[PDB]
Amino acid sequence: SFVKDFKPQALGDTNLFKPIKIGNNELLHRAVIPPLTRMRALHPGNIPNRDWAVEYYTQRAQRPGTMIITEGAFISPQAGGYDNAPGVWSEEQMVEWTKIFNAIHEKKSFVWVQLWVLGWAAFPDNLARDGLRYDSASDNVFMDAEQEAKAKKANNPQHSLTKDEIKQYIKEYVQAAKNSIAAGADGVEIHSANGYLLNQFLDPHSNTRTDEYGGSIENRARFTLEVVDALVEAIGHEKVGLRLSPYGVFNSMSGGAETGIVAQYAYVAGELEKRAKAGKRLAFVHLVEPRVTNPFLTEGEGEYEGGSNDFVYSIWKGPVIRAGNFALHPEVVREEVKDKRTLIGYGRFFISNPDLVDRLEKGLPLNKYDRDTFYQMSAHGYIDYPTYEEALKLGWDKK
Amino acid sequence: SFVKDFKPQALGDTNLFKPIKIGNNELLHRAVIPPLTRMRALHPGNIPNRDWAVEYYTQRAQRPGTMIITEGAFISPQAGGYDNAPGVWSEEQMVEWTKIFNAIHEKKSFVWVQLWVLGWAAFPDNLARDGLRYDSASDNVFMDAEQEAKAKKANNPQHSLTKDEIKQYIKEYVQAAKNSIAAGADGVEIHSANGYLLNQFLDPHSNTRTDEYGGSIENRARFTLEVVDALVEAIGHEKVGLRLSPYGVFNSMSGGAETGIVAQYAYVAGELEKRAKAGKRLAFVHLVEPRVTNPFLTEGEGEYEGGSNDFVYSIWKGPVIRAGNFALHPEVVREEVKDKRTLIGYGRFFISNPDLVDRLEKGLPLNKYDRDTFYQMSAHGYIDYPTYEEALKLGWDKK
Ligand SMILES: Cc1cc2nc3c(=O)[nH]c(=O)nc-3n(C[C@H](O)[C@H](O)[C@H](O)COP(=O)(O)O)c2cc1C
Ligand SMILES: Cc1cc2nc3c(=O)[nH]c(=O)nc-3n(C[C@H](O)[C@H](O)[C@H](O)COP(=O)(O)O)c2cc1C
């Protein structure tokens, strides 16, 4: 069915339908598909789903000029820990990713691979099964109760990385980015948000290190900016994006309760503009809004009102993508895109609406999403959400 | 004469005329007199002007419940270097400051003393005459051409403070704050703005130190927060304010060109909220707007548009006073005071308009200021600007 009590508003008269160049890509509109894990990859091997993944992505790349950011992909076995999320380290994975990039490109859209490293959010027991460490910034702070029950059942205790093991993760980031560009992706997004490994180093609560990687704003930002620099040297700055969630509390990050959190993120944004001046301006900065502090809470829940992401615009002067409960709020989008370098990411409603861009342009009703198939090993709730036409044929009132 | 082509707007219906408590003071409206050096103090001795200062301050304290922040006062001889600005270290100065505090208080207004230390903005030759050092954060960066011509004529070379000499300045800050409260002031404002000594330590361009006081966001902020902490232990947090100018370029500060400048100030604001939580919330934070990057440029000149002070509101949650070209822009003030904890500082127009608060409330024309007597050893252009009544009697068209 369609979302019951939503009053749609056509947005075809706003800057959301004005072209913008992002890296090497000339987008025809500014609604982007933000990275969405869907757990349909195959075990063993973390292989992109052979039956359904090309279709899913082809469906959402139907409006020409759409920028699509893939589900997070593990850079290596040690960066992983969920059996059904895909990786981007082996030939076998890349043979399936090439087919996905080709299909999106045949539809004249673009595809950016999000590079993912789990840290303490990984399952310690999957990793122990495979002989891998359970990594984080520190070893005296854990993510939550059931993550520590898991780690000790598994007898795979949380480990503070050494500088050498951080260096190895940077090695893997570069290779995975090389693999994605060689297989045909237009660019990569460094996931440094939502409480996963790079964010565990950025955050004061998860990072109690005393070396060069913890203990001050500069040191907590070190591993994220070494990744930016390594990938910029490897594949070019116009092929690299960075995602940040200043106010997120998902996976036990501090959010607005940490009084130093705006300074921690203002520093990263300032270092990025610094490089921009020296010629190496990243393709974009992607921000998760305080409108959504936890993506598994219903739209309207976990909204943080004591802070804003607008400080980033005083520092970084390049394109910024903003995501977080924008689909049910065209009146907020309307104001936000008056800014000429702002793009809007629509997550949960791009899951249920393959043709979201036409529905936004035209002010058409929105298909409800089914939360129960967000993570399911099924085609159902993945490739069978109807376009508006199909939904009318199905009678989702109007027949 | 009145300002020729200004269209006044009455502001009596806005939050600028709603009471607010600031420290121990219950202000009856939110227009404050920001600190304004006027150079009428007497040499030798940096004595507050015996003939005119009580009158000046009495005139501007005429609307009950007005918060007045004094001209900057030197905490000690070594903090000074301008012969005609006042100090707050000797008995002789305090006997004249007591008379000023009494007069303001008889008018049922309040008075906060701004504590001032010059650093590299001092005249090296006045200081050498008196046997004093020419101080700054560093010794390999100078303020400008004529400050270095002065220093070498005077053979009084710029000196990087040692930790012991920083400690001594903190000793003097506490004593000067004790002296002001003992003589009857309601509170003190720490001047950490406009390119003077504490701001020379906060700024990356003026601070190239490698010790505990330079070299990172935390270290550059160290001397300002040790001052905050020392004064809070000495006289109470509800009697201490802090003034900051994130985007100012006056006296050779970096402003918005430094990509790290928002992070440097977001850190200070976050440390202040940190203490606020631990019970010691400062009376207010006072910010100079990017609307005025240099106060000696005519209203409308030197406006920095690539940055905003609004990030401070995401971090500090207490009262904030904002100053910078607000008198000729009631439409900007109207929007800005919709926020319930914002106060507006009016500088240059409180010089020329003793009764500015009534003229703001009622939408009455504004007296032009005479830039030539801002710094003059005269009563003219200091105590003889007319109230609206007097200006009508004088025929400043309308007779
Ligand atoms: C099912 C699901 C999976 C997600 N997976 C990822 C992911 O792989 N990478 C990421 O950075 N964010 C992920 N997110 C967050 C979204 O990109 C987006 O920031 C969030 O859903 C808020 O936007 P929304 O309100 O438009 O859905 C996920 C969210 C959902 C609901
Ligand atoms: C004559 C004059 C003297 C000033 N003296 C000081 C001072 O002692 N302390 C201070 O922090 N700012 C000083 N300022 C700055 C003002 O407090 C204010 O921030 C600035 O004038 C911008 O406000 P305006 O546009 O309302 O005048 C001075 C400005 C002027 C024009």
- State the DSSP string of A65-97: T-EEEEEEEESSSTT---TTS-BSSSHHHHHHH
Q: Which of A219, A225, A262 to mutate to test the interface with B (most CBs of B within 10 A)?
A: A262
Question: Is A180:A86 a contact under the CB 8 Å cutoff?
Answer: no
Question: Is A295:A328 a contact under the CB 8 Å cutoff?
Answer: no
- DSSP character at residue A2: B
In this complex, which of A259, A267, A310 lies closest to B263 when CB atoms are compared? A267
Question: Is B325:B292 a contact under the CB 8 Å cutoff?
Answer: yes
Structure tokens at B127: 């200081």
- Beta strand A320-323 with A342-345 is parallel
Tokens 């936004």 locate to A360
Q: In chain B, what's the furthest Cα-to-Cα distance? A: 65
User: Measured between alpha carbons, how far is residue A382 from residues A37, A166, A349, A366, B208 in Å?
Assistant: 11, 36, 12, 16, 57
Output phi, psi for A385, to 5 deg.
-75, 135
Q: How many CB atoms lie within 10 A of CB B340?
A: 9
Identified catalytic residue from B56, B57, B196, B304: B196
Ligand 2 centroid – CA B269 distance (Å): 22
Which neighbouring-strand residues pair with B150?
A: none
Question: Is A89:A74 a contact under the CB 8 Å cutoff?
Answer: yes
Residue B262: list chain A partners with CB under 8 A.
266, 269-270, 311, 314-315
Calpha distance A314→B255 (Å, rounded): 12
Calpha distance B19→A127 (Å, rounded): 61
Task: Give the number of the atom of ligand 1 that is nearest the alpha carbon of residue A327.
Answer: 26
Which residues have a Cβ under 8 Å from the Cβ of B142 and sit 6 or more positions away?
B120, B148, B151, B158
Calpha distance B67→B110 (Å, rounded): 5
User: Measured between alpha carbons, how far is residue A265 from residues A256, A259, A269, A322 in Å?
Assistant: 12, 12, 6, 15
User: Measured between alpha carbons, how far is residue B198 from residues B222, B245, B311 in Å?
Assistant: 9, 11, 21
Calpha distance B238→B23 (Å, rounded): 4
Q: Which of B220, B254, B265, B315 to mutate to test the interface with A (most CBs of A within 10 A)?
A: B315
Nearest partner of B134 among B206, B125, B44, judged by Cα? B125
Output phi, psi for A114, to 5 deg.
-85, 120
Angle, helix A91-106 to helix A163-182, in steps of 10 degrees: 50
Indicate which residue's Cα is closest to atom 22 of ligand 1: A324
Question: Is A217:B263 a contact under the CB 8 Å cutoff?
Answer: yes
Ligand 2 lined by B36 (C-beta under 6 Å): yes
Identify the burial level of B280 via C-beta atoms within 10 angstroms of its C-beta, where 0-12 means exposed, 13-18 middle and 19 or more buried. Answer: middle
Question: Is A176:A229 a contact under the CB 8 Å cutoff?
Answer: no
Tokens 């509390």 locate to A249
Which residues have a Cβ under 8 Å from the Cβ of B257 and sit 6 or more positions away?
none
Q: How far apart are the first and last CA of chain B?
A: 12
Residue A261: list chain B partners with CB under 8 A.
270
Calpha distance B72→B55 (Å, rounded): 18
A314–B contact, CB cutoff 8 A: yes
Calpha distance B237→B224 (Å, rounded): 15
**DSSP-based three-state secondary structure for A246:** coil
Ligand 2 lined by B107 (C-beta under 6 Å): no
Q: Which residues of B247-263 are buried (b: 16+ CB within 10 A; e: fewer)?
A: bbbbbbbbbbebbbbbb
Q: How many CB atoms lie within 10 A of CB A294?
A: 14
Calpha distance B103→B85 (Å, rounded): 20
Full DSSP string of B6-58: ------TTSGGGS-EEETTEEESSSEEB--------BTTTTBPPTTTHHHHHH
Question: Is A243:A288 a contact under the CB 8 Å cutoff?
Answer: yes
Q: How many CB atoms lie within 10 A of CB A365?
A: 20
Method for this entry: X-ray
Q: Please tell me chain A's helix, strand, coil percentages from 3-state DSSP, rounded to the nearest 5.
A: 35, 15, 50
Question: Is A195:A252 a contact under the CB 8 Å cutoff?
Answer: yes
**DSSP-based three-state secondary structure for A110:** strand
User: Measured between alpha carbons, how far is residue B94 from residues A213, A324, B84, B168 in Å?
Assistant: 51, 58, 16, 21
Using the beta-carbon criterion (under 8 Å), do A263 and B308 form an inter-chain contact?
A: no
* Probe target for ligand 2 pocket from B348, B370, B374, B382, with the most ligand atoms within 8 Å of CB: B348
Q: Which element (helix H / strand E) includes A115?
A: strand A110-116
Calpha distance A347→A286 (Å, rounded): 13
Calpha distance B128→B95 (Å, rounded): 28
Q: How many CB atoms lie within 10 A of CB B389?
A: 10
Nearest partner of B48 among B123, B113, B108, B105, judged by Cα? B113
Question: Is B19:B26 a contact under the CB 8 Å cutoff?
Answer: yes
What is the resolution of the experimental data for this entry, in Å?
2.0
- DSSP character at residue B2: B
Calpha distance A97→A156 (Å, rounded): 32
Question: Is B384:B352 a contact under the CB 8 Å cutoff?
Answer: no
Angle, helix B53-60 to helix B91-106, in steps of 10 degrees: 30
**DSSP-based three-state secondary structure for A370:** coil
Phi-psi region of B152 (alpha: psi -120 to 50; beta: other; left: phi over 0): alpha
In this complex, which of B217, B261, B310 lies closest to A310 when CB atoms are compared? B310
Question: Is B284:B343 a contact under the CB 8 Å cutoff?
Answer: yes
A270–B contact, CB cutoff 8 A: yes
Q: Please tell me chain B's helix, strand, coil percentages from 3-state DSSP, rounded to the nearest 5.
A: 35, 15, 50
Hey, which bits of chain B come out as E strands? 20-22, 25-27, 31-32, 67-74, 110-116, 134-136, 158-160, 187-191, 240-244, 284-288, 320-323, 342-345
- DSSP character at residue A351: H
Output phi, psi for B263, to 5 deg.
-65, -35
Which neighbouring-strand residues pair with A367?
A: A2
B308–A contact, CB cutoff 8 A: yes
Peptide bond preceding B44 in cis form (omega within 30 of 0): yes
Which CATH number is associated with domain B1-399?
3.20.20.70
Structure tokens at B141: 């960066």
Length of chain B: 399
Calpha distance A73→A173 (Å, rounded): 11
Peptide bond preceding A44 in cis form (omega within 30 of 0): yes
Calpha distance A340→A321 (Å, rounded): 12
Distance from CA of B214 to the nearest CA of A (A): 13
In this complex, which of B218, B260, B314 lies closest to A311 when CB atoms are compared? B314
User: Measured between alpha carbons, how far is residue B224 from residues A248, B244, B298 in Å?
Assistant: 30, 10, 30
Q: How many CB atoms lie within 10 A of CB A354?
A: 24
* Residue-range domain boundaries for chain A: 1-399
Calpha distance A315→A320 (Å, rounded): 12
Query: How many helices and strands (H and E) does chain B possess?
Result: 14, 12
Question: Is B359:B366 a contact under the CB 8 Å cutoff?
Answer: yes
Calpha distance A380→A388 (Å, rounded): 18
Structure tokens at B55: 């009158």
What residue numbers of B does the annotated binding site for FMN cover? 37, 114, 243, 348
